Design an enzyme around this catalytic site. Sequence first.
Site, PDB file in Angstrom:
ATOM      1  N   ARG A 150       1.015  -1.507   0.137  1.00  0.00           N
ATOM      2  CA  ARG A 150       0.101   0.442   0.145  1.00  0.00           C
ATOM      3  C   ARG A 150       0.536   0.974   0.120  1.00  0.00           C
ATOM      4  O   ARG A 150      -0.086   2.479   0.193  1.00  0.00           O
ATOM      5  CB  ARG A 150      -1.227   0.464   1.120  1.00  0.00           C
ATOM      6  CG  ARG A 150      -1.327  -1.018   1.177  1.00  0.00           C
ATOM      7  CD  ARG A 150      -2.967  -1.899   0.122  1.00  0.00           C
ATOM      8  NE  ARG A 150      -3.590  -2.723   0.169  1.00  0.00           N
ATOM      9  CZ  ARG A 150      -4.170  -2.908  -0.893  1.00  0.00           C
ATOM     10  NH1 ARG A 150      -4.306  -2.400  -2.400  1.00  0.00           N
ATOM     11  NH2 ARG A 150      -5.473  -4.332  -1.129  1.00  0.00           N
ATOM     12  N   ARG A 254     -16.816  -6.053   4.518  1.00  0.00           N
ATOM     13  CA  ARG A 254     -18.114  -6.460   3.600  1.00  0.00           C
ATOM     14  C   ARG A 254     -18.102  -8.338   3.748  1.00  0.00           C
ATOM     15  O   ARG A 254     -19.653  -8.409   3.719  1.00  0.00           O
ATOM     16  CB  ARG A 254     -18.257  -6.197   1.869  1.00  0.00           C
ATOM     17  CG  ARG A 254     -17.579  -4.997   1.429  1.00  0.00           C
ATOM     18  CD  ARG A 254     -18.424  -3.711   1.867  1.00  0.00           C
ATOM     19  NE  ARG A 254     -19.670  -3.835   1.140  1.00  0.00           N
ATOM     20  CZ  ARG A 254     -19.863  -3.774   0.065  1.00  0.00           C
ATOM     21  NH1 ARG A 254     -18.701  -2.887  -0.457  1.00  0.00           N
ATOM     22  NH2 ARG A 254     -21.283  -4.055  -0.918  1.00  0.00           N
ATOM     23  N   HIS A 326     -19.087 -12.284 -14.921  1.00  0.00           N
ATOM     24  CA  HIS A 326     -19.486 -12.049 -13.806  1.00  0.00           C
ATOM     25  C   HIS A 326     -21.533 -11.346 -13.337  1.00  0.00           C
ATOM     26  O   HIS A 326     -21.570 -11.449 -14.636  1.00  0.00           O
ATOM     27  CB  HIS A 326     -18.801 -10.262 -13.717  1.00  0.00           C
ATOM     28  CG  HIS A 326     -17.856 -10.318 -13.466  1.00  0.00           C
ATOM     29  ND1 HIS A 326     -16.314  -9.947 -14.498  1.00  0.00           N
ATOM     30  CD2 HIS A 326     -17.416 -10.222 -12.232  1.00  0.00           C
ATOM     31  CE1 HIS A 326     -15.621  -9.647 -13.911  1.00  0.00           C
ATOM     32  NE2 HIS A 326     -15.361 -10.048 -12.510  1.00  0.00           N
ATOM     33  N   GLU A 356     -30.055 -11.127  -9.231  1.00  0.00           N
ATOM     34  CA  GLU A 356     -30.531 -10.865 -10.526  1.00  0.00           C
ATOM     35  C   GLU A 356     -31.987 -11.469 -11.454  1.00  0.00           C
ATOM     36  O   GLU A 356     -31.779 -10.937 -12.036  1.00  0.00           O
ATOM     37  CB  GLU A 356     -29.072 -10.826 -11.773  1.00  0.00           C
ATOM     38  CG  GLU A 356     -29.185 -12.817 -11.903  1.00  0.00           C
ATOM     39  CD  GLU A 356     -28.408 -13.346 -10.808  1.00  0.00           C
ATOM     40  OE1 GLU A 356     -28.774 -12.515  -9.637  1.00  0.00           O
ATOM     41  OE2 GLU A 356     -28.186 -14.319 -11.332  1.00  0.00           O
ATOM     42  N   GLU A 383     -31.850  -1.793  -6.900  1.00  0.00           N
ATOM     43  CA  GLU A 383     -30.852  -3.628  -5.724  1.00  0.00           C
ATOM     44  C   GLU A 383     -31.806  -3.706  -4.922  1.00  0.00           C
ATOM     45  O   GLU A 383     -31.787  -5.005  -4.438  1.00  0.00           O
ATOM     46  CB  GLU A 383     -29.753  -3.041  -5.602  1.00  0.00           C
ATOM     47  CG  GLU A 383     -28.928  -4.401  -5.180  1.00  0.00           C
ATOM     48  CD  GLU A 383     -28.293  -4.464  -6.143  1.00  0.00           C
ATOM     49  OE1 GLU A 383     -28.327  -3.663  -7.345  1.00  0.00           O
ATOM     50  OE2 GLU A 383     -28.087  -6.007  -6.047  1.00  0.00           O
ATOM     51  N   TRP A 458      -8.951  11.962  11.970  1.00  0.00           N
ATOM     52  CA  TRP A 458      -9.732  10.605  11.501  1.00  0.00           C
ATOM     53  C   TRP A 458      -9.341   9.754  12.997  1.00  0.00           C
ATOM     54  O   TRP A 458      -9.807   9.244  13.514  1.00  0.00           O
ATOM     55  CB  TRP A 458      -8.860  10.324  10.530  1.00  0.00           C
ATOM     56  CG  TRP A 458      -9.162   8.343  10.706  1.00  0.00           C
ATOM     57  CD1 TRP A 458      -8.541   7.802  10.225  1.00  0.00           C
ATOM     58  CD2 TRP A 458     -10.215   7.999   9.989  1.00  0.00           C
ATOM     59  NE1 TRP A 458      -8.991   6.827   9.574  1.00  0.00           N
ATOM     60  CE2 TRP A 458     -10.167   7.331   9.507  1.00  0.00           C
ATOM     61  CE3 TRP A 458     -11.769   8.620   9.579  1.00  0.00           C
ATOM     62  CZ2 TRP A 458     -11.310   5.829   8.722  1.00  0.00           C
ATOM     63  CZ3 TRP A 458     -12.762   8.141   9.385  1.00  0.00           C
ATOM     64  CH2 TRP A 458     -12.569   6.566   9.128  1.00  0.00           C
ATOM     65  N   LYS A 462     -12.036   8.336  14.846  1.00  0.00           N
ATOM     66  CA  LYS A 462     -12.735   6.679  15.063  1.00  0.00           C
ATOM     67  C   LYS A 462     -12.366   5.719  16.671  1.00  0.00           C
ATOM     68  O   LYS A 462     -12.808   5.393  17.043  1.00  0.00           O
ATOM     69  CB  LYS A 462     -11.094   5.966  14.442  1.00  0.00           C
ATOM     70  CG  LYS A 462     -11.510   5.993  12.912  1.00  0.00           C
ATOM     71  CD  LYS A 462     -13.300   6.527  12.628  1.00  0.00           C
ATOM     72  CE  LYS A 462     -13.823   4.944  12.428  1.00  0.00           C
ATOM     73  NZ  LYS A 462     -15.552   5.021  11.975  1.00  0.00           N
ATOM     74  N   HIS A 486     -14.338   0.733  -8.316  1.00  0.00           N
ATOM     75  CA  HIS A 486     -15.802   1.240  -8.056  1.00  0.00           C
ATOM     76  C   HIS A 486     -16.087   2.911  -6.604  1.00  0.00           C
ATOM     77  O   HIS A 486     -17.408   3.426  -7.115  1.00  0.00           O
ATOM     78  CB  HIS A 486     -16.571   0.366  -6.800  1.00  0.00           C
ATOM     79  CG  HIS A 486     -17.085   0.694  -5.878  1.00  0.00           C
ATOM     80  ND1 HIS A 486     -17.600   1.223  -4.902  1.00  0.00           N
ATOM     81  CD2 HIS A 486     -15.743  -0.646  -4.767  1.00  0.00           C
ATOM     82  CE1 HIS A 486     -17.263   1.169  -3.667  1.00  0.00           C
ATOM     83  NE2 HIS A 486     -16.452   0.110  -3.716  1.00  0.00           N
TER      84      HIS A 486
END
EC number: 3.4.17.23
Lengths: 584, 193
Positions: A150, A254, A326, A356, A383, A458, A462, A486
Amino acid sequence: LTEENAKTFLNNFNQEAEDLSYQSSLASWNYNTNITEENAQKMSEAAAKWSAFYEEQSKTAQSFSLQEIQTPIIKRQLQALQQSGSSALSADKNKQLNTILNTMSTIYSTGKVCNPKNPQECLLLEPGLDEIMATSTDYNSRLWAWEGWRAEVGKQLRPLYEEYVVLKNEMARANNYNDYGDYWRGDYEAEGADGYNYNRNQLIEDVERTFAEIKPLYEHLHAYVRRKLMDTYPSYISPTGCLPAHLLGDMWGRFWTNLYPLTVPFAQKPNIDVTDAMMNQGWDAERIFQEAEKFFVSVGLPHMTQGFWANSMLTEPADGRKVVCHPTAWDLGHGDFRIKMCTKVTMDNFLTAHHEMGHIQYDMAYARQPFLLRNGANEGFHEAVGEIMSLSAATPKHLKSIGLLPSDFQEDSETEINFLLKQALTIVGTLPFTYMLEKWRWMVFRGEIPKEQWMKKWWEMKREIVGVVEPLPHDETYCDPASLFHVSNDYSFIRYYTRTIYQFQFQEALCQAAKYNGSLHKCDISNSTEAGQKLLKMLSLGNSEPWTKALENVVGARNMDVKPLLNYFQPLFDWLKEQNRNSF
Amino acid sequence: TNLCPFGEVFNATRFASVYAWNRKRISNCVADYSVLYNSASFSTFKCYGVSPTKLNDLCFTNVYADSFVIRGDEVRQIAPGQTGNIADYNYKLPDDFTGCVIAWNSNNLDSKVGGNYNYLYRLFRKSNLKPFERDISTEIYQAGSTPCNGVKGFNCYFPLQSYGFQPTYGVGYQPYRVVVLSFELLHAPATVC
Ligand SMILES: *[C@@H]1O[C@H](CO)[C@@H](O[C@@H]2O[C@H](CO)[C@@H](O)[C@H](O)[C@H]2NC(C)=O)[C@H](O)[C@H]1NC(C)=O
Ligand SMILES: *[C@@H]1O[C@H](CO)[C@@H](O)[C@H](O)[C@H]1NC(C)=O
């Protein structure tokens, strides 16, 4: 005047747009089936032709000034076509501006990253091996293997983005608006009559007052996970600092490849082995999909086209003949309505298929409002339609009444907790991220100070929110929204925010009219026509009627309502609330 | 005995357009209608005011056959007391008329890959068309920003557009082949029976 010039220009717009969209969709189909890169070249040519023609339409939108005297219903279309968009600007500036995002993406696919100090299992960062080579709970050999990666990415992201943000300010200065952050939210305005206008700052007034009363929901979530990490080995959570962030494997919050299995603390109840017991029967992809139409004959919705079952691609390849697999459902323009997903047979394949499946049924509801309303009616419903039917189909009593699961195995009152743990996990840990991120996103392009002081606050934010900190902080070589396909490519990001609320709103909407006593979780879909009748009319609305007026007429709703979400699980929130009094 | 050749008219080779279509004449012929009744290949064989059983026994002096191709959805929209773009600018039927309308499907023949753009439509006219209209003239649409003197300014643009045709379209938009039977009685002798 008399709405003939507008009618004719819009109809020519419809014809040319349908032809161009059909051409582009056909090119996409030929590219993903018979890839030769000259089909992609023709893709680019048709897209450039479409863009230039649309820019000419934007120029010709200077054909009739509006002012205020008119009160038509076609004013939505008028402003949609008069929208500036990427038009204007010098032919030199945007011509090099648009050559930035694609060349940014090139440094990602060509980079090769694999296990450091380990020639074995060395392969690209692809999901084929990433699940096992990254999301494994290891402490000693994983700490320093990602700082270098990173830092290698963020070697040039700060110098590139410091110029990128000011170079996109030219669109802010020539967008007919005042701020780039408010440019996104400036297109959501819905007015059809007085008293149903959308206030630009209605969100900041209503939501922020209600965010104070939901505080205990978050502090006590952390007390649950410590039941496992502290139990096994006394070296994860150092008392001086806070919990680590590397062993999780995904800071995006996620998916959970290891938390999800070891989730129920007692771990004495028997799990579900449906797939192993059903593989013998012979339920393959083609044998699966009949459930949708079996439901819909009881509902009454129209059946699919011949091409729908003629275009499945649910067969296995011969030997290594891979393709781009996909989840992609497409309208493909002039009534094509084709689904493309090369799926095998798995347990989660059921959760896939319906998700879908819902897209195409939702799209087959507003085909009578030309290309003016064939677009997505709302960014959140798109969605929600796909996920609501799926979660409803995920009912064990739904999957027992067909005749498959024996009635000797009756439903229990504790396995619903295990069923809904991940469902309540994946759609709760993102809302604070998105709410902080979007507003401060609109804040940071003001540029009061550059980005060398925000990261300091930040960590304090947090710690006062959840209390997360690492013993030895890194240097400023990162950018969180940068390493994301995205996010960096500038899509709609509240679209990953809204879907959590509206699904529960509509579940409540059905369960308040399902005429069912007992609990509110046993709502079942099959053999119900009134719900579909009242739902299809809402789907077949589009941009004709504001969502505010629609929700008013249906149940009454000036704004978003989350108390359905709260009250639908507060009877199940006792476990999260009262058993968590011994920790902060 | 001495039957009238409907087959060459129906199973044609070169086909008619909707803005340049022409009439067909039927005289000195014999009527064979049981074939149409039991044709078994009919997308929409619906018509009111005439019964097929006795339509064999009826005779008319002149018969006009009309054939054209339109989008599949609007096949039943062609009727007296109806509206629409085709009805108001492309083709209109008299209200008193009492003939019969028949629909076919021609995906296997008419359609192809590539969107055959030969078929057209006439949208531009100052008013609505009178029943039973055929003209070759292309009178200037009275819309001149200031002149439309062959200049592409305001309201002056290309009036002709296409209709793409691929087999991948939906069933309701597949090209349907439609023929129209005209029935009327004239004082002149009716040799068609
Ligand atoms: C996809 O279909 C084409 C159609 O024949 C296959 O062959 C290509 O045909 C085009 C046009 O005639 C030629 O320009 C190419 O040289 C052909 N070969 C290619 C693209 O490899 C093509 O083989 C099919 N693709 C696949 C992967 O089967
Ligand atoms: C018209 O359709 C095909 C093509 O010519 C032909 O074989 C058929 O017999 C014809 N139909 C009739 C004569 O009714």
